[PDB]
Structure 1
Amino acid sequence: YPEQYNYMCDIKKTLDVGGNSILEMPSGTGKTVSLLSLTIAYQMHYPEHRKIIYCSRTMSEIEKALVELENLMDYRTKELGYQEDFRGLGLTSRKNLCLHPEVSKERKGTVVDEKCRRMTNGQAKRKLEEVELCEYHENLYNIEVEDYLPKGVFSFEKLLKYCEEKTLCPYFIVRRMISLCNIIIYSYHYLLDPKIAERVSNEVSKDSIVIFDEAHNIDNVCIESLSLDLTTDALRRATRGANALDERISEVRKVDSQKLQDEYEKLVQGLXXXXXXXXXXXXXXXXXXXXXXXXXXXXXXXXXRAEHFVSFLKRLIEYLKTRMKVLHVISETPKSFLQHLKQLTFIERKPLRFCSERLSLLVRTLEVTEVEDFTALKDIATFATLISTYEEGFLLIIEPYEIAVPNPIMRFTCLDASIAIKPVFERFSSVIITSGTISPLDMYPRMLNFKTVLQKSYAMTLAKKSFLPMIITKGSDQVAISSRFEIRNDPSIVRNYGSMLVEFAKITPDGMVVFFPSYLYMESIVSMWQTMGILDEVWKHKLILVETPDAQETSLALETYRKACSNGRGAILLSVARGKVSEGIDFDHQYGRTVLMIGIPFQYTESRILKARLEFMRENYRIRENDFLSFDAMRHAAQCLGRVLRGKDDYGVMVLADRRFSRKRSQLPKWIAQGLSDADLNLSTDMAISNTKQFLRT
Structure 2
Amino acid sequence: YPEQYNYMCDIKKTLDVGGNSILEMPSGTGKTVSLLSLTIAYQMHYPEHRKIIYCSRTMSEIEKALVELENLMDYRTKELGYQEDFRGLGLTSRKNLCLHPEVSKERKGTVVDEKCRRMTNGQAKRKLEEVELCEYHENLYNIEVEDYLPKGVFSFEKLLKYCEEKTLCPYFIVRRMISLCNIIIYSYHYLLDPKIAERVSNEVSKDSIVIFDEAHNIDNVCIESLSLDLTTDALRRATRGANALDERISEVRKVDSQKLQDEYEKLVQGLXXXXXXXXXXXXXXXXXXXXXXXXXXXXXXXXXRAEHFVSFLKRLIEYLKTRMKVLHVISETPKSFLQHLKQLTFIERKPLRFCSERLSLLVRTLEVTEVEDFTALKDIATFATLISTYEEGFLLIIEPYEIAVPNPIMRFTCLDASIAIKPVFERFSSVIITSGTISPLDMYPRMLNFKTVLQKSYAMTLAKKSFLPMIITKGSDQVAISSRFEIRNDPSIVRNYGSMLVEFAKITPDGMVVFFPSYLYMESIVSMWQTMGILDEVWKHKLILVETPDAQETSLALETYRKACSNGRGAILLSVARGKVSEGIDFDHQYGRTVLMIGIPFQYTESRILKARLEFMRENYRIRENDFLSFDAMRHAAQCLGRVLRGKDDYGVMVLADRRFSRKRSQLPKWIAQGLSDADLNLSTDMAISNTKQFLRT
TM over 0.5: yes
Task: Measure the CA separation in 2 of the matches of 1:349 and 1:384.
Answer: 10
What is the root-mean-square deviation in Å for CA atoms of aligned residues?
0.5
The alignment partner of 2:41 has SS state of: helix
8 Å CA contact 2:596–2:654 kept in 1: the answer is: yes
The alignment partner of 2:695 has SS state of: helix
8 Å CA contact 2:474–2:676 kept in 1: the answer is: yes
Query: Equivalent residue for 2:483?
Result: 483
Report Cα offsets for 1:56-102 as digits up to 9, x if no partner: 01011111000000111111011111111100010001000000101
Q: CA deviation at 1:369?
A: 1.2
Task: Measure the CA separation in 2 of the matches of 1:674 and 1:399.
Answer: 45
Query: Equivalent residue for 2:159?
Result: 159
Q: CA deviation at 1:308?
A: 1.0
Report Cα offsets for 1:11-44 as digits up to 9, x if no partner: 0101010000000000000000111101010011
The alignment partner of 1:185 has SS state of: strand
Report Cα offsets for 1:233-271 as digits up to 9, x if no partner: 010001111111111111011111001011111111111
Task: Measure the CA separation in 2 of the matches of 1:39 and 1:628.
Answer: 38
Q: CA deviation at 1:366?
A: 1.6
The alignment partner of 2:150 has SS state of: helix
8 Å CA contact 2:355–2:381 kept in 1: the answer is: yes
The alignment partner of 1:630 has SS state of: helix
Query: Equivalent residue for 1:178?
Result: 178
8 Å CA contact 2:100–2:135 kept in 1: the answer is: yes
Report Cα offsets for 1:368-396 as digits up to 9, x if no partner: 11111111100100000000011000000
Query: Equivalent residue for 1:258?
Result: 258
Q: CA deviation at 1:408?
A: 0.5
Query: Equivalent residue for 1:441?
Result: 441
Q: CA deviation at 1:504?
A: 0.3
The alignment partner of 1:629 has SS state of: helix
Report Cα offsets for 1:391-424 as digits up to 9, x if no partner: 0000000011111111101000000011111011
Query: Equivalent residue for 1:358?
Result: 358
The alignment partner of 1:547 has SS state of: coil
8 Å CA contact 2:514–2:573 kept in 1: the answer is: yes
Task: Measure the CA separation in 1 of the matches of 2:686 and 2:154.
Answer: 45
Task: Measure the CA separation in 2 of the matches of 1:609 and 1:134.
Answer: 45
Q: CA deviation at 1:181?
A: 0.4
Report Cα offsets for 1:465-504 as digits up to 9, x if no partner: 0000000000011100110111110110000000001100
Task: Measure the CA separation in 2 of the matches of 1:80 and 1:428.
Answer: 31
The alignment partner of 1:349 has SS state of: coil
8 Å CA contact 2:125–2:132 kept in 1: the answer is: no
8 Å CA contact 2:27–2:437 kept in 1: the answer is: yes
Higher relative helix content: 1
Task: Measure the CA separation in 1 of the matches of 2:529 and 2:546.
Answer: 18
Query: Equivalent residue for 2:235?
Result: 235
8 Å CA contact 2:249–2:307 kept in 1: the answer is: yes
Query: Equivalent residue for 1:668?
Result: 668
Q: CA deviation at 1:132?
A: 2.2
The alignment partner of 1:210 has SS state of: strand
Q: CA deviation at 1:116?
A: 0.6
Report Cα offsets for 1:417-453 as digits up to 9, x if no partner: 1111101111111000000011110000100000000
8 Å CA contact 2:601–2:636 kept in 1: the answer is: yes
Task: Measure the CA separation in 1 of the matches of 2:98 and 2:678.
Answer: 55
Query: Equivalent residue for 2:24?
Result: 24
Aligned length: 665
Task: Measure the CA separation in 2 of the matches of 1:454 and 1:518.
Answer: 33
Q: CA deviation at 1:608?
A: 0.3
Report Cα offsets for 1:143-190 as digits up to 9, x if no partner: 000000000000000000000100000110000000000111000110
Query: Equivalent residue for 1:292?
Result: none
Report Cα offsets for 1:294-348 as digits up to 9, x if no partner: xxxxxxxxxxx00111110011011000000101010000000000000011001
Task: Give the 5 Å matches for 1:18-417.
Answer: 18-271=18-271, 305-417=305-417
The alignment partner of 1:92 has SS state of: coil
Task: Measure the CA separation in 2 of the matches of 1:456 and 1:650.
Answer: 23
The alignment partner of 2:696 has SS state of: helix
Report Cα offsets for 1:171-222 as digits up to 9, x if no partner: 1000000000011100011001000000000000001000110000000001
Report Cα offsets for 1:575-606 as digits up to 9, x if no partner: 00110000000000110000000000000000
Task: Measure the CA separation in 2 of the matches of 1:266 and 1:654.
Answer: 66
Q: CA deviation at 1:530?
A: 1.3
Unaligned runs of 5+ in 1: 272-304
The alignment partner of 1:540 has SS state of: coil
Task: Measure the CA separation in 2 of the matches of 1:369 and 1:11.
Answer: 51
The alignment partner of 1:215 has SS state of: coil
Task: Measure the CA separation in 2 of the matches of 1:620 and 1:505.
Answer: 46
Q: CA deviation at 1:46?
A: 1.2
Query: Equivalent residue for 1:420?
Result: 420
Task: Measure the CA separation in 2 of the matches of 1:660 and 1:133.
Answer: 61
Report Cα offsets for 1:662-683 as digits up to 9, x if no partner: 0110000000001010100000
Task: Measure the CA separation in 1 of the matches of 2:6 and 2:409.
Answer: 52
Query: Equivalent residue for 1:280?
Result: none
Task: Measure the CA separation in 2 of the matches of 1:646 and 1:538.
Answer: 25
Unaligned runs of 5+ in 2: 272-304
Runs of 4+ in 1 over 4 A off after TM superposition: none
Task: Measure the CA separation in 1 of the matches of 2:247 and 2:544.
Answer: 50
8 Å CA contact 2:400–2:407 kept in 1: the answer is: yes
Q: CA deviation at 1:540?
A: 1.3
Task: Measure the CA separation in 2 of the matches of 1:637 and 1:83.
Answer: 43
Query: Equivalent residue for 1:493?
Result: 493
